[PDB]
Amino acid sequence: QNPISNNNTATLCLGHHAVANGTLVKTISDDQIEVTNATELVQSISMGKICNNSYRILDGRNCTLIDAMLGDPHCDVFQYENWDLFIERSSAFSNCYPYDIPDYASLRSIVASSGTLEFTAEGFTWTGVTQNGRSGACKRGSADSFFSRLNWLTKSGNSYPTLNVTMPNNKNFDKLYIWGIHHPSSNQEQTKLYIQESGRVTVSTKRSQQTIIPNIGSRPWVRGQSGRISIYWTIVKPGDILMINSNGNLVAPRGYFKLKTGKSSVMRSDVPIDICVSECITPNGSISNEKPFQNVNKVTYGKCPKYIRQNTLKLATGMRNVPEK
Amino acid sequence: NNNTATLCLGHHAVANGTLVKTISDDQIEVTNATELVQSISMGKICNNSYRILDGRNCTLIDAMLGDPHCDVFQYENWDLFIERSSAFSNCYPYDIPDYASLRSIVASSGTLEFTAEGFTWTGVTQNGRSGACKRGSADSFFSRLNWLTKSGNSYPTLNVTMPNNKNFDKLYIWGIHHPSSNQEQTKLYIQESGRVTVSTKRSQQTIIPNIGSRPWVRGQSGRISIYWTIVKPGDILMINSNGNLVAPRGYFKLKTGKSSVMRSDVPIDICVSECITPNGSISNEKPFQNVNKVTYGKCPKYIRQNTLKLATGMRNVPEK
Amino acid sequence: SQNPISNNNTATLCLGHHAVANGTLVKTISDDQIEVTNATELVQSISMGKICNNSYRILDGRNCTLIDAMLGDPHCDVFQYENWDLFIERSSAFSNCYPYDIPDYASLRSIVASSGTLEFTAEGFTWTGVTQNGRSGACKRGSADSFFSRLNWLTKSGNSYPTLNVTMPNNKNFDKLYIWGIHHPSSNQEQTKLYIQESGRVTVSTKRSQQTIIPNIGSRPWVRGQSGRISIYWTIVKPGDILMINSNGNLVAPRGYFKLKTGKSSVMRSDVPIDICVSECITPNGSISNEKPFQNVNKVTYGKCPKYIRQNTLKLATGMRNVPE
Amino acid sequence: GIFGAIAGFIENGWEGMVDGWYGFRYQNSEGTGQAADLKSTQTAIDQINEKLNRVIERTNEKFHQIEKEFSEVEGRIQDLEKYVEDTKIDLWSYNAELLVALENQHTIDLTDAEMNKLFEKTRRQLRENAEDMGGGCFKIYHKCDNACIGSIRNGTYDHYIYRDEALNNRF
Amino acid sequence: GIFGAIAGFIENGWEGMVDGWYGFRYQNSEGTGQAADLKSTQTAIDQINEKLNRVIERTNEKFHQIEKEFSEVEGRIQDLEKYVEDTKIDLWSYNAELLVALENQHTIDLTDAEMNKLFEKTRRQLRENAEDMGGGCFKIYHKCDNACIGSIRNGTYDHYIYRDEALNNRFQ
Amino acid sequence: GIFGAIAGFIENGWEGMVDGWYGFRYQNSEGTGQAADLKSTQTAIDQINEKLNRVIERTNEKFHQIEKEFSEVEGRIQDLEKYVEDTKIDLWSYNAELLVALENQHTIDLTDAEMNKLFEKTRRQLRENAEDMGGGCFKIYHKCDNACIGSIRNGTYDHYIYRDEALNNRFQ
Ligand SMILES: *[C@@H]1O[C@H](CO)[C@@H](O[C@@H]2O[C@H](CO)[C@@H](O[C@@H]3O[C@H](CO[C@H]4O[C@H](CO)[C@@H](O)[C@H](O)[C@@H]4O)[C@@H](O)[C@H](O[C@H]4O[C@H](CO)[C@@H](O)[C@H](O)[C@@H]4O)[C@@H]3O)[C@H](O)[C@H]2NC(C)=O)[C@H](O)[C@H]1NC(C)=O
Ligand SMILES: *[C@@H]1O[C@H](CO)[C@@H](O[C@@H]2O[C@H](CO)[C@@H](O[C@@H]3O[C@H](CO[C@H]4O[C@H](CO)[C@@H](O)[C@H](O)[C@@H]4O)[C@@H](O)[C@H](O[C@H]4O[C@H](CO)[C@@H](O)[C@H](O)[C@@H]4O)[C@@H]3O)[C@H](O)[C@H]2NC(C)=O)[C@H](O)[C@H]1NC(C)=O
Ligand SMILES: *[C@@H]1O[C@H](CO)[C@@H](O[C@@H]2O[C@H](CO)[C@@H](O[C@@H]3O[C@H](CO[C@H]4O[C@H](CO)[C@@H](O)[C@H](O)[C@@H]4O)[C@@H](O)[C@H](O[C@H]4O[C@H](CO)[C@@H](O)[C@H](O)[C@@H]4O)[C@@H]3O)[C@H](O)[C@H]2NC(C)=O)[C@H](O)[C@H]1NC(C)=O
Ligand SMILES: CC(=O)N[C@@H]1[C@@H](O[C@@H]2O[C@@H](C)[C@@H](O)[C@@H](O)[C@@H]2O)[C@H](O[C@@H]2O[C@H](CO)[C@H](O)[C@H](O[C@]3(C(=O)O)C[C@H](O)[C@@H](NC(C)=O)[C@H]([C@H](O)[C@H](O)CO)O3)[C@H]2O)[C@@H](CO)O[C@H]1O
Ligand SMILES: CC(=O)N[C@@H]1[C@@H](O[C@@H]2O[C@@H](C)[C@@H](O)[C@@H](O)[C@@H]2O)[C@H](O[C@@H]2O[C@H](CO)[C@H](O)[C@H](O[C@]3(C(=O)O)C[C@H](O)[C@@H](NC(C)=O)[C@H]([C@H](O)[C@H](O)CO)O3)[C@H]2O)[C@@H](CO)O[C@H]1O
Ligand SMILES: CC(=O)N[C@@H]1[C@@H](O[C@@H]2O[C@H](C)[C@@H](O)[C@@H](O)[C@@H]2O)[C@H](O[C@@H]2O[C@H](CO)[C@H](O)[C@H](O[C@]3(C(=O)O)C[C@H](O)[C@@H](NC(C)=O)[C@H]([C@H](O)[C@H](O)CO)O3)[C@H]2O)[C@@H](CO)O[C@H]1O
Ligand SMILES: *[C@@H]1O[C@H](CO)[C@@H](O[C@@H]2O[C@H](CO)[C@@H](O[C@@H]3O[C@H](CO)[C@@H](O)[C@H](O)[C@@H]3O)[C@H](O)[C@H]2NC(C)=O)[C@H](O)[C@H]1NC(C)=O
Ligand SMILES: *[C@@H]1O[C@H](CO[C@H]2O[C@@H](C)[C@@H](O)[C@@H](O)[C@@H]2O)[C@@H](O[C@@H]2O[C@H](CO)[C@@H](O)[C@H](O)[C@H]2NC(C)=O)[C@H](O)[C@H]1NC(C)=O
């Protein structure tokens, strides 16, 4: 009751700090509660550009990975390339002979993962047939041309004999063989190019085979051609053999691609490639990977935060904030 | 005593508590709890929130092709299509490579909006009919397909073109006919060997007939194979054939939909619900359900457990 | 206090907890490392080294693949009418008959393995106008030339190979599995020698489905003396449904159906020996104990198994914090 | 409980208390009485009420998906579809089981805490004027009518008024 | 620990105590003694005894599944099989890590709480007859033979019998 | 908070404390004063510092995966690709929501606990020389200069030498 504290007494108070401007977080007890400090755990901002200093980034510009492979004339700059990540632009196009690839997606996946377009030419013998067939739909500069990695075979004189060739794999790695079949526009065209009325391609190893018939009919003009080619691949394993038997319509390989078990891939984006630092890439550009989570894109490559729906998650980095007065 | 007082502290309890599970305890009694799993359905599909289409005796495919007993389904659209287990085909015997994919694409689109197109077929007989596909007690055929045959003693190489000048994808359903003998082949189509090539700029499909007897279905030993082609805005459909063509009559409108198809046998009636399972509609009050893994709509998550009790009150400690 | 000898009119009562000399470190939400009185390992990372034969019914494939045993390869004859919970395929297994391929091999293997039996009933087929039981020098059974015990090679009889047209109703109450095939000759001479026709064809049909295959004349890699091949297909006939087979050449007929059950069975690739012990979980590295909730041995498991995780160790405290003296 | 108030140093709960979750019973010179404590009760309810909404989001729409029931036998591609659905269900069934137990452990702990706090708040108010009898009761060592008990209840009890009476009675 | 008993006001554990997790030691006229407290020990063990069984099941029986190792490069569908499996493993690996960390945290928390509860139980019985010295020890300000200690340990201690002696000893 | 210290019996926090998270304020014949407690601050900080690293694996590389965007409708294979990815994303979103909620809950409770523990550590030291005023303050009942407050702060306060004075001021 005495206003002046005693000399024989003292007061001791215990307390904790508080800051002027707190910040709201969520707990198990509270929708919102104010803490002294907190951290953002979700990355929502990308750099707007793809950094090319950590991984080898290859800009495909006007070319799809597949076109670069086959040897589409306007993709000639991509010969023997290798990458960690290949960028396919939306504006990309094809400018050679019209084609399709049954299971296109798989072949793209395989090559993208391999991470290389190393190509060794092999000396196949095509006894008794015309080689290096070309088209006006596939201009190499001024000249009619064809896919650089493919060999369009036709009759010589008045015949097209039964082709039967072999190619053994005496190397320490898997060979990838890209080959195809041609589909003419009419029976008249079929017998004009191949003599036989029913073409036939058989490609085989010791324990596997693929057998294809050509398709005949009128189709829409693509760069002046109603004919088409279908693409096929074959993996020959070390110790195995490659065999090709055909009585017509064969679009022959020129050699093989080296297959690797790599860490590579392919990504679709229209975002510019630029010098900077980053170990994680998305279609929206490189992103920082300090934060455990990211809200930028479900498609990622490299050392990436996990993608989640939420644009923000706040983690308390301090105590409940109870301001003065 | 008058120089003292007693102040006691306490908490409430109930005579009738309920058992819950914690990290510390297998079973512990609390004052009050709540069920987190919906394990009972309404026994019926409610058709008030989503547009629900009863397929009755028809599958989605049969309704699309235009099976006679499915003619009531022409120009329909849905949020959810209900295929009954007792559905049946009743037209020409057919098969479809990648049935599941076509069905899935159509169901998702959520509409059967069809638009006839003037295909000129020079030198062939149109509107071929069958005894397997009776409509009005007479021979007929799929309403959306045009079965072509020889005219006189001729079936000339058909070559037609049909451009997509619209701002959407066109879906074409066409097909090929497989006759049961070589006489049948040459009787209907003249040529010993048939061929159908259907193409756009970005694709091509060529199908050859297989001659031979298949098992007797509604009289017929022949068969028909269905195929589909999507034509994009700016693209162009082309059909080339020298026999065995089962021509389309037009196109279906494809659209990015939030629609699906479901298998069920339960009745459909008016009621309030925003979640649908094969066993009927279910209440979405709870976060989980044990009714069915097949759901559509705003649905609780399916889990293995049939019960999870969430404590909503303190530990219950009844009076001595 | 002090007083060396404590007073009779007072007492001391201390409360405390136990401790062990050798503690063990665990991880919590608060601490990277903290010492507790005891902990248990929750990750199983040691196998038994062998497959236990006592809990589940294990079947050793020895040097036969499940598909060979089903086809009826001579060196697989011991496997006739066998059933299993788990079939073990060995890495050293081989085929010893006519060189073949099965498109979607993966699917047929999985259908049979899951069924869990090789129950095969013969059926009375009528092959009017052809020779039956075609044999090969690449498929030796006993001493004589032989063939897959479950398939029936058909060739020309006399001057002609007539159009085959055979039925077989399923009047039972279970799904029937028919295995059939088609032959690819190496040359044109061989085609007409064996089947007369320039072109073979096989159409197998039920009421609801059909399958047509065309052969493909041509040389494949020399395998056990043969450049020809066979391609194996299957058809499942439902109850009430009916099988039909049509061919004007190249048919490798069925002899009967396999019974199809919805089994709780499988097939696994492993090289470890099978031995006497009781265990309820099986991995390619052998059987493992199932007393721990998690395992790190193999992602491939069968039976009552702990869940596969990437971590090789996880300690769960089974005691209070250990504070030594 | 980790605080050991409920099912601890408080022997049992009261069935006769309907107006609150926590409260007071008393005997003084004016008889006995019972009162409920609202701040404690509200803190409890506020934390418990719709607590799952903090972790589990408001049920969202799902439309076309994948087939989950099969009439035919297909193998590889069907195997995958089955495995995908099975993995999904098993993970969610785990999420559900863990969530409920965590949430329940939390509800038990927080309701025990409120009781412990209510005891401590009272004790501090009484200072040296009362002793803990165990069982969650205080012996109050001074004459203490209903209006004096009221001051304790609403937290305006001034111990300096009774200190000398109390300390006299205690020693 | 959040209660700050173990590795807090209790300095260290007792390796000497083999028949319990929590207990007493005492010194008085009759000598020195030690005894375990079975209630608080049992509560601790019951909560800790295979506490995983409460959220995760022993093992699940699984039969035919998908392939998980491949010899040929196939592409699209193989990609998917690998991805599906990888996702599963990553998710369960996260579940495992979180669960253990949570369970461990909960084990330490609960065992500290027991120590704290037993100390409070004792404080309350003793009333004004005893003072907390720190280290989890009480000075009992009255003659207190083994019989009297026993009464504390079985919760039947009657503070009223000793209050006068106790109070006289405390304030002199 | 479950201990009832922070935003409990301690009314508010001290903005003018920048040298620690917990501490003391005092008044005696030499004036007023403020001092941080570093052991309390440190215990809290260590538990909070990079606390996620204890449950989340150091971000690892992911290379070639499945396709997640499609330009054409394909049906069955694409449905599964889409379903698998949608499933993975939803599960991780849940993990994230729950982890943050739990971690935050833990942060409140542990810092609240430290406050409480520091209080009880001080009470124990003081024995019968001080009373609890409420508001987290102690009234010490003996002459108590800066050097004496210091001995409380660093844990070396000896109650025995002040006891007689303290009991006399408390009870007369
Ligand atoms: C089955 O039916 C299909 C579809 O109708 C036929 O395919 C068409 O065939 C005709 C015949 O040649 C093609 O017509 C040609 O078009 C060329 C390209 O046109 C460009 O420019 C026009 C501008 O109007 C655009 O419409 C178009 O998109 C292109 O940008 C022209 O170069 C040709 O013109 C030339 O015509 C004569 C000779 O025909 C020359 O002497 C002239 O100098 C002139 O340059 C020509 O008109 C048409 O493009 C094809 N369309 C498609 C979609 O393929 C098949 O022929 C038919 N098959 C059978 C067996 O009957
Ligand atoms: C290749 O081999 C196959 C199989 O042998 C042949 O296919 C059979 O073809 C014959 C006709 O050529 C079919 O015969 C018809 O069977 C119908 C079956 O439906 C009945 O099913 C059962 C039969 O017990 C019953 O529940 C009930 O009776 C059903 O009606 C009959 O309905 C038909 O009967 C009608 O015609 C007969 C004349 O034969 C008259 O009595 C009446 O008018 C009656 O309405 C008919 O008999 C047989 O179904 C075919 N079987 C299969 C499995 O397809 C192929 O013909 C052969 N191919 C070649 C090129 O030779
Ligand atoms: C299309 O082109 C392909 C490839 O060029 C041809 O395929 C080859 O055809 C020849 C002749 O038919 C095959 O020759 C055969 O080889 C057998 C195995 O040879 C390998 O293994 C043995 C192991 O002991 C080695 O000695 C040898 O170096 C090889 O590595 C041999 O067993 C046969 O040779 C002879 O064996 C006995 C010896 O006791 C003799 O008595 C016989 O005369 C016998 O001929 C056998 O001739 C060769 O293997 C084929 N290679 C492949 C990869 O298939 C196609 O024939 C061709 N087709 C057409 C239509 O032109
Ligand atoms: C009015 C008319 O019919 N003129 C004849 C030419 O046909 C027409 O004109 C040409 C310029 C094209 O526009 C044709 O589409 C059109 O019908 C005809 O030229 C040849 O036409 C054929 C098809 O009728 C074919 O397109 C030829 O094109 C090449 C090409 O450039 O791609 C020539 C290549 O060397 C050849 N490659 C080979 C054989 O490996 C290809 C190949 O035949 C097709 O890609 C296979 O589908 O075609 C074109 O030269 C000409 C008859 O040869 O006479 C004109 O009077
Ligand atoms: C015992 C006998 O030969 N009876 C003759 C009838 O054939 C028999 O009965 C029919 C229903 C089938 O089961 C036959 O296998 C059986 O032999 C014959 O009926 C006609 O048979 C022919 C067989 O060549 C054919 O199936 C006819 O089918 C139609 C049909 O109903 O669908 C008639 C349609 O007009 C026709 N459509 C066309 C031409 O566009 C179709 C079509 O040709 C096939 O579906 C193509 O695969 O067939 C059937 O009427 C009867 C009349 O000739 O004479 C009996 O003596
Ligand atoms: C050295 C030489 O020129 N020898 C021939 C010999 O040809 C060889 O055949 C053996 C098997 C291989 O080494 C070949 O590379 C080599 O060309 C003739 O043998 C016949 O050759 C046939 C090739 O046209 C067949 O391979 C045939 O094989 C059998 C077999 O062993 O299985 C006989 C069997 O009855 C038959 N099965 C039937 C009818 O059902 C079967 C099939 O016809 C084919 O496999 C179908 O693709 O083949 C073999 O006998 C020999 C016979 O005239 O002549 C020597 O001069
Ligand atoms: C509080 O009281 C209610 C109502 O009396 C209790 O609910 C009852 O609990 C029993 C089991 O404890 C239930 O029995 C079970 O269901 C059926 C009974 O026919 C049987 O098939 C099962 O084997 C099982 O025994 C009973 O259904 C249920 N009654 C009602 C009306 O819901 C509740 O258990 C009490 N809780 C406590 C903690 O005392
Ligand atoms: C805190 O309580 C006191 C006294 O006890 C009261 O408790 C209240 C919760 C309520 O039940 C009340 O009826 C009961 O008396 C309050 O002081 C009393 O206030 C009333 C009028 O409200 C007066 O008539 C009394 O004279 C007075 N008592 C005394 C001894 O003066 C007090 O108002 C209350 N404080 C607050 C802040 O609410």
Ligand SMILES: *[C@@H]1O[C@H](CO[C@H]2O[C@@H](C)[C@@H](O)[C@@H](O)[C@@H]2O)[C@@H](O[C@@H]2O[C@H](CO)[C@@H](O)[C@H](O)[C@H]2NC(C)=O)[C@H](O)[C@H]1NC(C)=O
């Ligand atoms: C609680 O203990 C008291 C006495 O303390 C005993 O504690 C035991 C653990 C024992 O080993 C020993 O340390 C000590 O004797 C019990 O009261 C005693 O028990 C009987 C009653 O018939 C008599 O023989 C004693 O005279 C009596 N002592 C006193 C002081 O009353 C008591 O029974 C026990 N209570 C319970 C509920 O178990």
Ligand SMILES: *[C@@H]1O[C@H](CO)[C@@H](O[C@@H]2O[C@H](CO)[C@@H](O)[C@H](O)[C@H]2NC(C)=O)[C@H](O)[C@H]1NC(C)=O
């Ligand atoms: C399957 O193939 C052959 C039998 O044709 C076995 O080969 C024998 O292997 C044993 C030891 O493994 C050795 O005696 C010889 O190397 C082989 N003997 C003969 C006569 O060929 C092979 O072992 C079988 N595989 C398995 C797993 O049993």
Ligand SMILES: *[C@@H]1O[C@H](CO)[C@@H](O[C@@H]2O[C@H](CO)[C@@H](O)[C@H](O)[C@H]2NC(C)=O)[C@H](O)[C@H]1NC(C)=O
């Ligand atoms: C596992 O499989 C079976 C029973 O499931 C047993 O096979 C016996 O193996 C021994 C080898 O020690 C052989 O001598 C016997 O002939 C086999 N028995 C029969 C009935 O065929 C055996 O228990 C296990 N296999 C082993 C140990 O190899």
Ligand SMILES: *[C@@H]1O[C@H](CO[C@H]2O[C@@H](C)[C@@H](O)[C@@H](O)[C@@H]2O)[C@@H](O)[C@H](O)[C@H]1NC(C)=O
């Ligand atoms: C503990 O304090 C003892 C005395 O109090 C001191 O407080 C400090 C803040 C100091 O700066 C002076 O004001 C006082 O002397 C001191 O003598 C002991 O040395 C201290 N204990 C330890 C272990 O260092």
Ligand SMILES: *[C@@H]1O[C@H](CO)[C@@H](O)[C@H](O)[C@H]1NC(C)=O
């Ligand atoms: C602890 O373990 C080690 C053996 O690794 C041993 O040297 C030491 O003596 C052990 N001590 C006790 C008390 O168990």
